[PDB]
Symmetry: D2
Subunit: 334 residues, 4 copies
């Protein structure tokens, strides 16, 4: 049993908590930190507008929350400097506040007693970035201590981009992700550093940035310089699609693009990348554990220009990818 | 011209700005304070997800925003004592941050040179509380300097309750407001002092508190102890309905209940309370200037139990009410 | 095994089918009728925007759908006169089209071979109307052959009203149900017999009629003349609340109102009526199997005036009530 | 005054009626046909969930609706051949039912007394297809009698594609439109010819086809064979964006792409195509009178791959395009 801490018990933090409880044979979460009281945090754990009710008993007191009879320590320290992970023999910390994506700030978890930190986001100054199934074999357990599990959109794009680039050669590609709103956006028009994410999220199509396409090149260096893109945030609470339009020198058809994905999406990698010929809408991919669900019915080809589309539950899909990365870390030294 | 300042250029602050510009012939907003830069503030002024584009040119610089050629000084002071309302000859400040609903915190504006503060919410320690059309004739220009315009829901409920209580006598009533989500609620499930307002606002029916419950007694003391209620926040961006179920000793019918409203909703008071027999849905009452839009189709009566329903645009409606109150304050002595 | 047919394989029809799979050991759905082809109907069975992916394997051909290896005959007959329920040895028909709530039309199912018809709505000219847990003991297997399971709202209100009426005496009450939109409302402003339900359902609070308050009298005749109310349809896809305000001569407090429900919400009746002190929102009661989930936190009292609020999943909760009624009819002579 | 009839008084029909009142001095709507009674149709005319209250007085009787004192005849004929447009001296019929896009069926309007039919959608067997501002100069008043004003998406894509093809050259391109839901989608999961459009529109991202990029080739024949694409329908009630990714014949920059649009978007053409550097979201382009609002901030370039995005109010903007086309027909023979 490896012991995990969660810093930032938010959408991703609580998705991760439930992913561990539900999916892992060898991890347990034993401490969490947020900015609220235990009555509030247990309530949010127990009841979820997306995931439904937790199917285990949840109690709390002024020190802790107890889930299915297992006591979890709870903190409310804004500054991780004030945490003590070692007091709970915690091995791995998930950094999911959204405020410590700089690895020089996140490393405070290691100063506070943990051996490893996994940032639930694109990072700065990290030791390494990983998309499980794409580049996790380059994980170095001696030297990779504060790592990123990249973004939701990256975990969707990279698996697809790898398969298609390996087979045919991507010359350049531009991406649009049509993406569930997230808590970074405002419910009502209000100040934001991004003037478009300032706008009422549940009644708007909101264009905004994604670092996903260039972040893809962090995990697939061969695609450096070859990808860029943006997001349209739209009114669904979770569930997203990545739409990539790329050129290739190869001779391709709808059928051979789709065959390349189907051929790859098997075995362990097929837990990351699924292939589908179903009449999917976003609600069909909510609570799907894949990082990427390729939608063969949406493939288009015009000359040497290809459009492909892959779905992802930006909460749960991404979380399951992060758990796969976490399991690997836990499988090796420290 | 009486000159007005706005503290907190949010939903209500910007609604208020547009209402003054669109509706008033004798007020001018000349200074605003918020917590952001002028690029951001002027974007949110020009573009609105509810009200649409402002039909006038909007420019900005390091110290101001200019609307239709009229320069508005802008500040970014978290503490209102770092403002100077007197420097721009501002007589009346709208307090619409949501953080200064305690009148003894809102009086920081007076310290900074204002003569009158109107809090855009239920207040504590306030000089007085008004729902325009209901009790504004009680306004005391000498003694009422930091005042409350009450809440959206109160401004909906009190007109209706007054007409009905006056005609038939309300023994007790209990209200449910089915209410648009507001910026106090969370887009995704996240911490909040209210465990239900914590929950994703646009996919949930969310039970919670309403101001109106007890606050009606501030403007209608004869109903102290006789009313209470709550809110169901639901997924519409604006537009709300107050549903009041009450007992009366009077013998009443749907018809006599409706006739009481229709006979009162006339003249000046008709600007606060309207009577409709239209097949209304919430989008029909968005951008309606009334505090309370009585829906005669929804009246029900069973023995001595009565149900009445009134609509309100909890943004614009309330805002037009606050503008009425501001106009009254501006029409009387400012010492 | 009692054999069931479903006329109208819509939201309620398909809920019902899933509920049978999940919750019954003696019923089997063997035939369904709708107005579409089997490719379309099987797709709607498999993929559901509310309930998610059906866990069984689904196939179809030109006259059936096969679910988990069990072949279900499919018809496409607008007029039930053209049905033959006897061909597949059907005992009970669920009438869930919306169009045959007059028992004089729904008895066509009997003439077509069925032994019992359960109308999934308030009916007219019916033999009996039941809310399970309220008046199901009055079911008469000889003489009750075309019956009504009432509405969703009636299954929410009646349990709560029975308990409060029995304990305190309801003089008169008026109800507002704040109700999810349903399929008979319009996505865009468009013709409807009801001028408000004509209006775009997902952007409006839409006032409309409900007979539930007068249908309660069919299952609790002691409340004849003493209840009325209406609905507000709001933009959630399922999940609803009944808000009842009533007068009583009893001396009552919030506490004693709440205690009355808690005391009753036990044993078998408790599978119909639940009692909750949780901080519930509508997503929390999606897929709850109760007809009625009383919210003790929302109880208010002013003198002799009382307001109570009970939740219901107008799809799943109602369906679980209809299945309980079906199970009773199935347990007796047919 | 040229007299207009509207067949199908739905979203587009009623937008058109309002556009005529607001924007025309030489057209008059004098009769309409739908499938409903006049109480219902007058209510829908008066109250609009998107456009708000009509500022004219509306009354009705059993064969008409009166607006601002002007009596409009109302028919309820499912079959166009049972209409008599000569009764009310109608010159031009807007065909906006969705059911008569085949010109061989739409021509029944001509037999019923009209001189010209404008189909508010891509057509089959038509005399000609027009995107105002792009190819309306090819209109032939002798020979073009049953015509199409194309789709919303075509009216958005074609102006932008004309300019970028003229200046830089499109080799091939693939489009995604992120599009408001429309009334042919289902509110609740229900039978539809399209198995995705079957799915609850207000909670899903719904992929579906669009002939729009291939219909561009009808108004810009130089682009025949060079465009394809699809739509994602998303939960906003109106307001859409067309995202085109194309390979350019010449090297370009973001700045030069943006400059080309700004340079062209002037004069009459600029009433069709606008240029924006504003931080736009969908609610900002609701009720905009342009067919295409080019968003300079979303232009991206990687090598010879280019992504451009243009907004459109798929109701009002398209309707303003349709009215421009109507004015042109009205200004000339018959
Ligand atoms: N779809 C998604 O939501 C998604 C997917 C992939 C990655 N991510 C990333 O994961 C991170 C978390 O996003 P989220 O959607 O869960 O955000 P969130 O707002 O839902 O959760 C953040 C949580 O951290 C808490 N918090 C904030 N500052 C804190 C501090 N200093 N100390 C402790 N707790 C603090 C908040 O109270 C909240 O509970 C971000 O970096 C985001 O980009 C999000
Ligand atoms: N929205 C409604 O329906 C509604 C209706 C009636 C009354 N009200 C009341 O009006 C008040 C404002 O509500 P809102 O909906 O406009 O909120 P909001 O969040 O939309 O706006 C608040 C604004 O104040 C600014 N702000 C916050 N703290 C500040 C400070 N210290 N100094 C300066 N600016 C500051 C914020 O940046 C924001 O722009 C609240 O008291 C609320 O109860 C709201
Ligand atoms: N919340 C709810 O959805 C709810 C709850 C309780 C009761 N009900 C009642 O259940 C009934 C069905 O409602 P619903 O929500 O499932 O509606 P729905 O529109 O989802 O389903 C009706 C189904 O019947 C089919 N159909 C229509 N006419 C037909 C005919 N002549 N023959 C065969 N099939 C036909 C349709 O194609 C559709 O699949 C109604 O009476 C409604 O009042 C609905
Ligand atoms: N965004 C848009 O809504 C949009 C944009 C561009 C083009 N269009 C096209 O315009 C047409 C109408 O689309 P809409 O969105 O207005 O649809 P709609 O569903 O809002 O309107 C169609 C109207 O036609 C009526 N109708 C149906 N069959 C009829 C018949 N046989 N005879 C007479 N009336 C009949 C309906 O009752 C309804 O009022 C379609 O061809 C559509 O593709 C729509
Ligand atoms: O949903 C949350 C993502 O991690 C942030 O989105 P993105 O991957 O498009 O940047
Ligand atoms: O909507 C904003 C109101 O002022 C807050 O609602 P309320 O009046 O029900 O408290
Ligand atoms: O959910 C659909 C209902 O059966 C019809 O509404 P109601 O129960 O409120 O009458
Ligand atoms: O909006 C209605 C259109 O006619 C349908 O969309 P489209 O132009 O992408 O086909």
């Amino acid at each position: 049993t490896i012991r995990v801490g969660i810093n930032g018990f938010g959408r991703i933090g609580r998705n991760f908590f439930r992913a561990v409880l539900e999916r892992s044979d060898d991890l347990e979460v034993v401490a969490v930190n947020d900015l609220t009281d235990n009555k509030t945090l247990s309530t949010l754990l127990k009841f979820d507008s997306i995931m439904g009710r937790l199917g285990q008993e949840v109690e709390y007191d002024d020190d802790s929350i107890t889930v299915g009879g297992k006591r979890i320590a709870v903190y409310a320290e804004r500054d991780p400097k004030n945490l003590d992970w070692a007091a709970h023999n915690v091995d791995i910390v998930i950094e999911s506040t959204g405020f410590f994506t700089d690895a020089n700030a996140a490393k405070a978890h290691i100063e506070a007693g943990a051996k490893k930190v996994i940032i639930s986001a694109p990072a700065s100054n990290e030791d390494a970035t990983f998309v499980y199934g794409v580049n996790h074999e380059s994980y170095d357990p001696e030297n990779h201590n504060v790592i990123s599990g990249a973004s939701c959109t990256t975990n969707c794009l990279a698996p697809m981009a790898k398969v298609l680039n390996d087979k045919f050669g991507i010359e350049n590609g531009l991406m649009t992700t049509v993406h569930a709103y997230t808590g970074d956006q405002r419910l009502h028009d209000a100040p934001h550093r991004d003037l478009r994410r300032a706008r009422a999220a549940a009644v708007n199509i909101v264009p905004t940035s994604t670092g996903a396409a260039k972040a893809v090149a962090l995990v697939l260096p061969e695609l450096k310089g070859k990808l860029d893109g943006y997001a349209l945030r739209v009114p669904v609470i979770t569930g997203s699609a990545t739409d990539l339009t790329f050129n290739t020198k190869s001779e391709v058809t709808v059928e051979s693009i789709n065959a390349a994905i189907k051929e790859a999406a098997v075995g362990e990698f097929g837990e990351t990348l699924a292939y589908s010929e179903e009449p999917l809408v976003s609600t069909d991919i909510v609570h799907d554990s894949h990082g990427s669900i390729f939608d063969a019915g949406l493939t288009k080809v015009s000359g040497n220009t290809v459009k492909v589309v892959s779905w992802y539950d930006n909460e749960w899909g991404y979380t399951c990818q992060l758990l796969r990365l976490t399991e690997l870390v836990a499988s090796k030294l420290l």
